[PDB]
Amino acid sequence: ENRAQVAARQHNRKIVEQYMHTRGEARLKRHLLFTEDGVGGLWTTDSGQPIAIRGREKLGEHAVWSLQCFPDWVWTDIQIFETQDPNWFWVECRGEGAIVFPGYPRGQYRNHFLHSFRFENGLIKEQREFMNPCEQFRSLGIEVPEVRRDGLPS
Amino acid sequence: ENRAQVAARQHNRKIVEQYMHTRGEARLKRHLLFTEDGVGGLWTTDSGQPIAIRGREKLGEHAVWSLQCFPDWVWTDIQIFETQDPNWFWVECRGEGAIVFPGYPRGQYRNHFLHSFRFENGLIKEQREFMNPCEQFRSLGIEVPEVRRDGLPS
Ligand SMILES: CCCNc1ccc(C(=O)c2c(-c3ccc(O)cc3)sc3cc(O)ccc23)cc1
Ligand SMILES: CCCNc1ccc(C(=O)c2c(-c3ccc(O)cc3)sc3cc(O)ccc23)cc1
């Protein structure tokens, strides 16, 4: 059983590596790293609800929109964390690139991200990314609220 | 070497568990889980810069303000992730409690969190927590910007 867990972890790590280094036109095929019913998404948004895409083929359809809205996106400063679960990885990284959201001025977006990858049968069953939406607001020219600090010492 | 790494991971895990379960008056002594020069803080804020405190004694001083602003805070749904680094852990959890920020109405704050814990010689050298600040804005009655989605399909 330990041999099976070790083998799963090693293979899954290669998939995480491949995902994190998928750039440019290869983004059109990144969905093939998911199970048929795999889910990917952004878990931190202005609404408090995730923007999640469910199903490998729907993830592939979304990559068209991803490549339009973030045409040169790269992940950088990538640190991959294996865990005691051979099917669960975390990644700390940054990401950056142009942001071209319809109805907003073209901007430059940079942020810090955490990703969660859960695997089933050697492919990604659930990917989730987490960031501070305030930095995306800034990239879109959206005013960020400020918490008044007068009575809040650090 | 492997035995030493195994020993470090097992002890460090106990410190993470203790930190995550610390609530109530025990919060006044949570800083004793840190190295003398240890750092803790919130990495996701409206400004884009962390609110971090460096030094065990300064962390202890801050606990007074933590108990004022978050008088009944509890971490729930705790999942601890060991990693390939015996001195690095991640935690996925939620947190909840009253929020009592000076000059804002008293509110009820709930959020999802990720924590990072890095250890040195059996104590926490760096703790960092990550959340979506939009949920904290809501708890304070602060208006959250909304990204227009008319052109952005999911
Ligand atoms: C592959 C799974 C989906 N992955 C993502 C990745 C990034 C985003 C994203 O940046 C955001 C939106 C979006 C929706 C649909 C679309 O076509 C493109 C962008 S709306 C919105 C509001 C905010 O407050 C913050 C971020 C976003 C959304 C989903
Ligand atoms: C030593 C560990 C530091 N740990 C924390 C934990 C939580 C916060 C926090 O919620 C925030 C503030 C705060 C500052 C000083 C203080 O006394 C109490 C609260 S201001 C602010 C603005 C935002 O946009 C979002 C969050 C916060 C800050 C620091």
Side-chain angles (χ1 to χ4, degrees), chain A residues 4 6-9 11-28 30-35 37-67 69-154, chain B residues 4 6-9 11-13 15-142 144-145 147-151 153-154:
Chain A
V6 169
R9 187 177 288 102
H11 163 82
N12 295 342
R13 181 162 173 113
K14 295 179 180 175
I15 300 295
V16 176
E17 289 275 9
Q18 183 182 340
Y19 182 106
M20 295 307 304
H21 289 95
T22 298
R23 298 174 176 175
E25 294 302 300
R27 291 161 62 189
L28 294 172
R30 193 179 66 192
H31 64 286
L32 298 178
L33 302 179
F34 287 75
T35 62
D37 59 359
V39 180
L42 173 63
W43 253 245
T44 48
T45 74
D46 69 77
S47 73
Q49 294 302 307
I51 298 163
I53 305 293
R54 309 183 173 275
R56 180 186 63 216
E57 302 305 314
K58 291 180 185 180
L59 283 162
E61 296 175 2
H62 186 80
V64 178
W65 299 104
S66 176
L67 266 161
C69 290
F70 301 106
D72 59 7
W73 189 260
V74 295
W75 307 109
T76 68
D77 305 284
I78 295 160
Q79 305 180 271
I80 294 171
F81 298 95
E82 311 166 356
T83 76
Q84 70 270 30
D85 181 343
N87 292 308
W88 204 330
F89 291 70
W90 290 87
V91 181
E92 182 175 11
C93 68
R94 292 187 301 177
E96 63 172 283
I99 182 164
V100 189
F101 267 33
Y104 291 88
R106 184 189 182 95
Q108 180 60 205
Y109 175 37
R110 299 174 71 260
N111 217 346
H112 177 270
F113 293 78
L114 304 170
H115 293 251
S116 176
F117 295 88
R118 298 187 71 176
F119 284 81
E120 168 182 286
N121 300 330
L123 294 176
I124 301 166
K125 180 72 193 278
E126 183 193 66
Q127 177 273 341
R128 304 175 293 158
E129 63 202 67
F130 304 84
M131 50 60 161
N132 180 356
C134 295
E135 296 302 301
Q136 196 167 344
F137 299 159
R138 286 187 169 88
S139 77
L140 294 168
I142 295 167
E143 182 173 357
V144 179
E146 190 175 16
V147 174
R148 299 185 294 276
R149 289 282 305 267
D150 306 276
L152 291 167
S154 69
Chain B
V6 172
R9 187 177 285 103
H11 163 81
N12 294 343
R13 187 186 172 102
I15 301 298
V16 175
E17 290 167 356
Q18 183 181 340
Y19 182 106
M20 297 306 308
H21 287 289
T22 296
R23 47 174 180 255
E25 287 299 75
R27 293 160 59 188
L28 288 172
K29 287 179 179 183
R30 194 179 67 194
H31 64 288
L32 299 177
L33 301 181
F34 288 74
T35 65
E36 187 281 334
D37 64 357
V39 180
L42 172 63
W43 253 244
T44 49
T45 74
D46 69 77
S47 72
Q49 292 302 304
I51 299 168
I53 302 296
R54 175 172 286 273
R56 182 182 57 202
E57 302 315 307
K58 289 257 177 270
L59 288 166
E61 292 177 2
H62 181 80
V64 175
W65 298 105
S66 178
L67 280 155
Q68 178 183 309
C69 296
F70 300 107
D72 64 353
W73 191 257
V74 179
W75 302 112
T76 64
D77 301 283
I78 295 159
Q79 300 180 275
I80 296 169
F81 298 95
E82 315 171 336
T83 78
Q84 70 270 35
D85 181 346
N87 290 309
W88 205 330
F89 290 70
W90 291 87
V91 176
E92 180 173 12
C93 68
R94 294 187 58 81
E96 53 161 80
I99 182 166
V100 187
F101 274 25
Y104 289 89
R106 195 200 189 84
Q108 199 54 207
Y109 176 35
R110 293 177 60 78
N111 217 348
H112 177 270
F113 293 79
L114 302 172
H115 293 249
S116 174
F117 292 88
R118 296 189 70 173
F119 284 80
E120 175 182 283
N121 188 21
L123 296 169
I124 301 165
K125 178 70 176 301
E126 185 195 65
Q127 177 272 343
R128 304 175 292 155
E129 65 203 63
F130 304 86
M131 51 60 160
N132 181 356
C134 294
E135 295 303 300
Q136 194 166 346
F137 301 156
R138 283 181 174 91
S139 78
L140 292 168
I142 296 168
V144 178
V147 176
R148 303 184 294 276
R149 294 213 41 194
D150 298 283
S154 64

